[PDB]
Every structure is written in C-alpha cells, then in structure tokens.
Amino acid sequence: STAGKVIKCKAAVLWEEKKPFSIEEVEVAPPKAHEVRIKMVATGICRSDDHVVSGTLVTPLPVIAGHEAAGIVESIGEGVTTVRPGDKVIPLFTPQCGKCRVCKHPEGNFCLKNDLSMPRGTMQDGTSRFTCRGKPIHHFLGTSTFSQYTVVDEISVAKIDAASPLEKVCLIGCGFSTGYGSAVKVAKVTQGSTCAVFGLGGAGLSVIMGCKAAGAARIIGVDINKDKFAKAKEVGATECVNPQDYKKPIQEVLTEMSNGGVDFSFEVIGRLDTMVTALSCCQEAYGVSVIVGVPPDSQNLSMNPMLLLSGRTWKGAIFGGFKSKDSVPKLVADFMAKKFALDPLITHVLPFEKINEGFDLLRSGESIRTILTF
Amino acid sequence: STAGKVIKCKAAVLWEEKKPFSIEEVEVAPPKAHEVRIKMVATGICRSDDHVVSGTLVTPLPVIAGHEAAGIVESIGEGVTTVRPGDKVIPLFTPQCGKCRVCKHPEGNFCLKNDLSMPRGTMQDGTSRFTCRGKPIHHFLGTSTFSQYTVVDEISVAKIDAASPLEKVCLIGCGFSTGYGSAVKVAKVTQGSTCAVFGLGGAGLSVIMGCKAAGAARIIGVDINKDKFAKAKEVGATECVNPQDYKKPIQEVLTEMSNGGVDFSFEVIGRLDTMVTALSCCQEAYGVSVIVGVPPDSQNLSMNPMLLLSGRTWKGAIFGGFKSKDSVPKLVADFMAKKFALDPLITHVLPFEKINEGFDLLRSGESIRTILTF
Numbered sequence: 084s085t086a087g088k089v090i091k092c093k094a095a096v097l098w099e100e101k102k103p104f105s106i107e108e109v110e111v112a113p114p115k116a117h118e119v120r121i122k123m124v125a126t127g128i129c130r131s132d133d134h135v136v137s138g139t140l141v142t143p144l145p146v147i148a149g150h151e152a153a154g155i156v157e158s159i160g161e162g163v164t165t166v167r168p169g170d171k172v173i174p175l176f177t178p179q180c181g182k183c184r185v186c187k188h189p190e191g192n193f194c195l196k197n198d199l200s201m202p203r204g205t206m207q208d209g210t211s212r213f214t215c216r217g218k219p220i221h222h223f224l225g226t227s228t229f230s231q232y233t234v235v236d237e238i239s240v241a242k243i244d245a246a247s248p249l250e251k252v253c254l255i256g257c258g259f260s261t262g263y264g265s266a267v268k269v270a271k272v273t274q275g276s277t278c279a280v281f282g283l284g285g286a287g288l289s290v291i292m293g294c295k296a297a298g299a300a301r302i303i304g305v306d307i308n309k310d311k312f313a314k315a316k317e318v319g320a321t322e323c324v325n326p327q328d329y330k331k332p333i334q335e336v337l338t339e340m341s342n343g344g345v346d347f348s349f350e351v352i353g354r355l356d357t358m359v360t361a362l363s364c365c366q367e368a369y370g371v372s373v374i375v376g377v378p379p380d381s382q383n384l385s386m387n388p389m390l391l392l393s394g395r396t397w398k399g400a401i402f403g404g405f406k407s408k409d410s411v412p413k414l415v416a417d418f419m420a421k422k423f424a425l426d427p428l429i430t431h432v433l434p435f436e437k438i439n440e441g442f443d444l445l446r447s448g449e450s451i452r453t454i455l456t457f
Numbered sequence: 458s459t460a461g462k463v464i465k466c467k468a469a470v471l472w473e474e475k476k477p478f479s480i481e482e483v484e485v486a487p488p489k490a491h492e493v494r495i496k497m498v499a500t501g502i503c504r505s506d507d508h509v510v511s512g513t514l515v516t517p518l519p520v521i522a523g524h525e526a527a528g529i530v531e532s533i534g535e536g537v538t539t540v541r542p543g544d545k546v547i548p549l550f551t552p553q554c555g556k557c558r559v560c561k562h563p564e565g566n567f568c569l570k571n572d573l574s575m576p577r578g579t580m581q582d583g584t585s586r587f588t589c590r591g592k593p594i595h596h597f598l599g600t601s602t603f604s605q606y607t608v609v610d611e612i613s614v615a616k617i618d619a620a621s622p623l624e625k626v627c628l629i630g631c632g633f634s635t636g637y638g639s640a641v642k643v644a645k646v647t648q649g650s651t652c653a654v655f656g657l658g659g660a661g662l663s664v665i666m667g668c669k670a671a672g673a674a675r676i677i678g679v680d681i682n683k684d685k686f687a688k689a690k691e692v693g694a695t696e697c698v699n700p701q702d703y704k705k706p707i708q709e710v711l712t713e714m715s716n717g718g719v720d721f722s723f724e725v726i727g728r729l730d731t732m733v734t735a736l737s738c739c740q741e742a743y744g745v746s747v748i749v750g751v752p753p754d755s756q757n758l759s760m761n762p763m764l765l766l767s768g769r770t771w772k773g774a775i776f777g778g779f780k781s782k783d784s785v786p787k788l789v790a791d792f793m794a795k796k797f798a799l800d801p802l803i804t805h806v807l808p809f810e811k812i813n814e815g816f817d818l819l820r821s822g823e824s825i826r827t828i829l830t831f
C-alpha cells in the first residue's frame with residue numbers, strides 16, 4: 084500500500100549548526116533502481132551525529148543525520164537482489180560496493196563509494212530522496228536514520244537475522260563494531276598485552292570489549308569524566324586513570340605504569356592532543372596506536388616524527404576496519420550466539436520524538452548510548 | 458704489541474659543527490670489561506654522519522663520528538665471550554643487549570641501551586676511551602669508526618665471516634641493512650605491489666633493492682636530483698620522478714600514477730614535508746608509509762589525522778627493523794651466498810686520509826657511498 088508511492092513521515096531535520104533538531108514531516112521518495120526504502124525501528128545517538136550539530140564533522144546542511152540503526156525493508160527498487168521487503172536490515176554508513184580496489188583488497192574497508200572524504204550529502208546518484216517544506220534535504224553518509232523512513236543504496240544496507248532484536252543490534256551499525264574491530268582487527272591486540280584506551284564512551288567501551296576478547300592482561304581506561312570508570316571496569320578495564328588527577332602529562336604516567344610504554348593504545352575521543360598523547364604512550368620500539376576519534380574539521384596536529392622513527396606504528400580506521408556488508412550479518416549472528424554483549428552500552432531508551440533530550444543526555448556526560456524507538 | 462696499552466693512532470675528530478674533520482693523532486685506551494678494541498679496515502660515509510656536522514643530528518661534541526664500518530678485533534676486555542682477537546667484526550650503532558624488553562620482543566630492535574634517544578656520546582659505563590691533545594673526546598652511537606682503532610661495548614659488535622670482503626660488507630653496518638629491512642621487514646612489501654621511494658641515496662637504493670626482492674611490480678623513485686635516476690633504475694626502479702618537474706604537488710602526481718595511491722611509500726631523505734607527502738601518496742584505506750630519514754633536531758611536522766583515520770598505516774624504524782647482533786652476521790652470510798649486491802651502492806673508494814673529500818662528494822650530490830680504506 085506504500086510501494087512506489089511517496090511516503091510522508093516524521094524525521095528529525097537539522098536546519099543549521101548548533102541548534103536542536105526539528106521533528107517535522109518530510110516526504111520520502113520511492114526507491115530508484117538498486118535502492119532500498121526502510122522503515123526504521125531503532126536508532127542510536129552516536130557522538131558523530133553530534134559532531135554534525137557542532138560543526139566538528141562537516142557535511143552539507145540542511146540534513147537528516149543518523150547512521151547507527153536497524154529497520155525493516157518496506158520496498159526495493161528495480162534490480163535489488165540482496166534484500167526483500169520484510170527483511171530486517173542495518174544501514175551501512177561505510178558502503179561495500181564490492182567492485183573498487185579497496186573492496187577487493189584483503190584488508191581495506193573504506194569503500195571508494197563512501198560519502199565521508201568529500202561529502203555530497205546525496206544518494207550514490209547525486210540526488211536526494213528527502214523533501215521538507217518543499218525544500219530538498221541532504222542525506223548523511225548514505226544512511227539518514229533519524230527518520231521514520233529512509234532510502235539507501237543497496238551497497239549501503241545489509242540483511243540480518245530475522246529474529247534479531249532491533250533495539251539492541253542497531254549498535255552493530257556503528258559504536259560496537261567500530262570499537263571492537265579497532266581492537267581485534269585493526270590493532271590485532273595480542274594475548275597478555277597491555278592496552279590503553281583513551282575515551283570511555285560507546286566506542287571506547289567497545290574497544291575495551293575487544294581488548295578483553297583478545298586476551299589482554301591489562302586494559303587501562305583513560306577519561307576525564309570519572310563517572311565513566313565503573314562501566315569501563317565492568318566490561319574489562321583493569322584500572323582507570325583521570326588525566327586531571329595528575330601533575331604530569333598522562334603519556335608519562337602511562338609509560339611508568341606499563342614499565343616503558345603500552346603494547347596498544349587507542350584514541351577514542353577526537354582531539355588532536357590526545358591523538359599525539361596516545362601515540363606517545365605506546366612503547367617506542369614496538370608499540371601500536373590506533374586513532375578512532377574524529378578530529379575537528381580541517382585541523383592539523385603537530386608531532387615529532389622521532390616518535391615513529393624509533394619503531395612505533397600509527398594507524399586509524401573507519402568502522403573498526405570491517406568490510407561492512409560482509410561483516411554486519413556475521414556480527415549479528417555472533418550477538419545472537421552470545422559471543423559479545425550490547426546491554427552494557429545501552430544506558431537510556433527514549434522514543435524518537437524525544438531525540439533532543441537524548442542529545443542533551445550525551446552532551447551532559449550522563450549517557451553512553453541512548454536508543455531511540457520509532 | 459698493543460694489547461693492554463694505550464694506542465696512539467690517526468682519527469678524524471670533529472671539534473665543532475660546520476667544520477671539516479681534523480685528521481690527527483688520538484689516544485685510544487685499552488678495553489675494559491665487556492669491551493672490544495677494533496682495528497678499522499673500511500668505513501662508509503653515511504648522511505647521518507654529515508647530520509652531525511650540519512647540526513641536523515645533535516650529539517655531544519667534540520666527537521669521533523662514523524658508524525658504518527668493518528674491522529678486525531685487536532683485543533678484548535675481560536668477560537667478552539662473543540668475539541676474539543683476529544675476528545672480523547661490524548660495529549652495531551644499535552646495540553643488542555639481549556636482556557631488555559625490546560630485545561626480548563619478537564618485533565622490536567631499538568634496544569634500550571642505544572645512545573640515540575638521549576645521546577651521551579660515551580661507552581655504556583658513561584666514560585670515553587678517546588683523548589686528543591689531552592682532551593677527552595666523545596663517542597658516537599657507541600661506534601666511532603672514523604679512527605684507525607675504536608673501542609666498543611660487546612653488545613655493540615657482531616662477529617662476521619672470516620672470509621668477508623670488509624671494503625664491501627661495511628655497508629651492512631648501516632645503509633644497506635637499513636633500506637633493505639625497511640622494505641622487507643618493516644613495511645613487509647608484497648608481491649605485485651606498487652612502491653614509492655623518496656630519496657635515492659645509499660639507503661633509498663637499498664629500499665629499492667628490498668622492494669624488488671619482495672616482488673613489487675612497480676617501484677617509483679622520487680628525487681630532486683635527476684642524476685640519481687640511472688642507478689635507481691639499475692637496482693629495480695621502474696620509473697623515476699623529479700618533483701621540480703611538476704606544477705602539482707608530487708603526492709597528487711603519485712596518486713594519479715598509481716590509480717588511487719601506492720601500496721607502500723618510504724621517506725628516505727629526512728624532511729618533514731616529504732614525510733607528510735610520502736604518507737599522503739599511499740592509498741588512503743590500506744596504504745603503508747615508512748619513515749627512514751632523520752628529521753632536523755627538535756622540529757615537529759604538521760599533518761591532518763584524517764590521513765590515518767581512513768585506514769593508512771604510518772611507521773618508522775631504526776636500522777631496517779633488524780635485531781642488530783642477530784642479523785648482521787646473517788646478512789653477511791647472505792651476501793657471501795650472492796643473495797644481494799653491494800657494489801651498486803659504492804661509487805667511490807678513497808683512503809681514510811681523504812675523509813673530507815669524501816664528504817664533499819656526498820654534499821655535492823655526486824656520490825652514493827664512498828668507502829674509506831684505512
């Protein structure tokens with residue numbers, strides 16, 4: 084009864100930076116060839132969505148943000164072969180086209196069809212499926228999940244187990260998989276190692292889960308908000324340190340605690356200074372540091388290249404290094420088999436209509452993940 | 458006739474920065490416990506020695522520089538078990554104590570006993586074995602090979618094949634092993650990959666040798682001195698580019714040439730700008746860039762961390778990642794088995810007395826390696 088027709092529904096439109104989202108009616112076009120229209124069931128509030136509001140992450144406005152979500156296929160465009168109406172699905176903010184040099188590479192996952200490097204805020208075809216007040220509205224990372232319905236390209240959606248609890252597995256669309264993969268796939272944390280994790284939010288707690296699954300002997304959580312320490316320990320941190328408690332720079336503290344530097348460090352905040360601090364705190368000859376946090380737009384860090392010449396490895400990754408369409412269904416299957424837990428990340432639940440209150444909870448420091456239900 | 462006695466011999470003393478080496482008599486004390494006195498046979502002129510003259514690399518002056526060399530043991534102090542008088546040896550500018558956390562780690566080689574990070578210019582015991590005109594003279598990287606005789610700690614010397622040609626294998630003490638290992642051990646260049654090598658001197662040509670040995674399909678040499686291109690192609694470069702020939706930044710040129718970025722890049726110059734350029738020219742999702750060049754003292758580079766967040770890996774290494782005492786004898790054995798060539802790196806052979814002429818050849822761009830013979 085809606086296939087092939089424009090759908091009028093509610094979405095959270097961001098009309099300008101540093102303002103609340105506007106919950107209002109939008110018009111969602113039917114899917115074109117190789118596109119999929121999805122009825123959203125749950126969406127998470129991720130810090131990267133807040134980065135759009137703050138101007139930290141630049142993407143064209145006005146926009147429908149949201150990228151961590153799960154829903155049910157309402158209709159498919161011509162030529163779609165990988166999902167059907169009624170399937171449970173997770174939108175993929177990093178696509179997997181399967182045909183570019185990155186998708187064919189055994190390690191790479193940052194598909195060249197992504198809308199992150201040079202953001203257009205459109206579908207793959209350069210157009211938008213959203214209208215509000217008669218005005219076209221931009222998409223976000225090819226997902227735009229802050230809406231009762233969205234349209235995504237086929238390369239940006241994965242079919243998942245039909246029995247999946249969508250109000251939990253939406254975290255596999257961003258925060259969990261990013262942190263977990265950063266530890267187990269990107270850093271490749273080894274058994275018995277010492278790890279330092281900077282930032283104990285949704286993504287940082289998932290890094291800790293990955294370090295524990297990898298068998299690390301020590302996992303040092305670092306955060307300036309000591310209220311984050313209790314949950315960090317519950318999911319595997321062996322100790323937590325607040326840089327504000329020390330008279331010395333925390334890289335010096337961490338080097339002393341690890342008797343010469345840590346095996347693996349992770350920056351899971353998004354600050355230039357903590358990116359350099361995290362690199363510095365890993366052991367100078369064989370340490371590995373992984374950047375996960377999103378830096379402020381167009382800003383350069385400053386560092387001494389002798390930190391690398393001694394032997395350190397520095398790398399970063401999107402989405403924990405996972406090839407998105409291959410990995411999301413397998414991660415859901417592992418969740419269904421109890422191989423990892425998502426409940427520790429979910430601190431608050433709200434209806435979609437209270438999205439602004441959910442962003443208030445994130446900004447105040449009180450929440451890890453708020454899940455919004457449509 | 459010299460064991461247990463002070464030796465008066467010829468050495469090249471650097472009394473202050475930005476001056477020629479002073480060829481004059483020095484006194485070399487006999488070795489203390491766990492020390493080895495070596496009669497030098499051949500020593501190479503490496504850019505890192507010139508960095509001491511220029512102030513690029515800070516180490517205490519006055520100094521006997523030189524670190525790439527081979528010689529014959531004249532005497533050993535009490536407790537030495539790994540070399541004997543008469544053995545052919547290569548001094549190790551990176552020690553291998555075998556007891557520190559780095560030496561025990563399967564991948565680390567920057568032994569904590571090194572004199573690089575916080576240069577003292579002494580023996581391990583904090584004193585010097587050199588006197589000139591009655592004044593104590595500093596050591597350099599625990600080696601100090603610009604002298605007819607030197608004294609090194611046991612952890613900074615490796616015994617090599619008694620049939621080795623010392624006027625060639627001295628290059629295993631620095632330039633060859635650094636470049637070769639940077640490709641085959643640090644970067645782990647893969648078969649069929651595309652590589653870019655910035656800087657076509659002794660170390661850069663050895664990187665090329667390693668990339669070819671690893672089966673790279675394309676090896677792009679980059680140098681502002683087009684006179685370096687012929688030898689680079691002889692040792693494996695498939696193409697060479699001079700950044701001064703282009704109106705665009707070379708990172709953009711290399712990205713176009715490689716249809717989206719190279720698999721492996723190497724900075725083998727020692728400039729902050731080319732370190733960032735080399736990182737940028739590797740493929741954004743899976744490329745690897747290795748810093749080999751020594752940066753000017755105390756200077757920071759500036760870079761956008763999004764270059765790493767997309768998926769790039771950035772690392773550096775000392776001495777090609779090789780555990781020094783384990784690796785040097787094995788590399789000599791490989792050379793004797795004809796597994797690699799050193800003659801392509803040697804452009805000039807001069808008597809030690811012509812050390813300053815040898816540095817003039819390096820500074821003018823004319824030489825790759827000048828070998829000085831004692």
Ligand SMILES: NC(=O)C1=CN([C@@H]2O[C@H](COP(=O)(O)OP(=O)(O)OC[C@H]3O[C@@H](n4cnc5c(N)ncnc54)[C@H](O)[C@@H]3O)[C@@H](O)[C@H]2O)C=CC1
Binds near residue numbers: 257354375377
């Ligand atoms: N690379 C990728 O694919 C992804 C990147 N991100 C980015 O990772 C970062 C973390 O995301 P979330 O965990 O969702 O955000 P979050 O805001 O919940 O967690 C950040 C934590 O860092 C702490 N913090 C802030 N400043 C600090 C400082 N100077 N020192 C120590 N701790 C500090 C905060 O107290 C907070 O607990 C964000 O920048 C996000 O945009 C998130 C998921 C995907």
Ligand SMILES: NC(=O)C1=CN([C@@H]2O[C@H](COP(=O)(O)OP(=O)(O)OC[C@H]3O[C@@H](n4cnc5c(N)ncnc54)[C@H](O)[C@@H]3O)[C@@H](O)[C@H]2O)C=CC1
Binds near residue numbers: 392632
């Ligand atoms: N990491 C380690 O263990 C070692 C580091 N090094 C360092 O590697 C670097 C190279 O050493 P060598 O090969 O012996 O020196 P080299 O001086 O013979 O080679 C440097 C090359 O870079 C070229 N070059 C200079 N500026 C350039 C620019 N803007 N753009 C492109 N090319 C440029 C020069 O024309 C020259 O051919 C030095 O900084 C050296 O101190 C050397 C061996 C050990």
Ligand SMILES: O=CNC1CCCCC1
Binds near residue numbers: 129132257401
């Ligand atoms: O949070 C999800 N995606 C992020 C990934 C890093 C760049 C900004 C967008």
Ligand SMILES: O=CNC1CCCCC1
Binds near residue numbers: 573631751775
């Ligand atoms: O060239 C030999 N050794 C170099 C190693 C990198 C720092 C300066 C000295």
Ligand SMILES: [Zn+2]
Binds near residue numbers: 195
């Ligand atoms: Zn792709």
Ligand SMILES: [Zn+2]
Binds near residue numbers: 151257
């Ligand atoms: Zn996210």
Ligand SMILES: [Zn+2]
Binds near residue numbers: 554557559568569570
């Ligand atoms: Zn050691």
Ligand SMILES: [Zn+2]
Binds near residue numbers: 503506
């Ligand atoms: Zn050298």
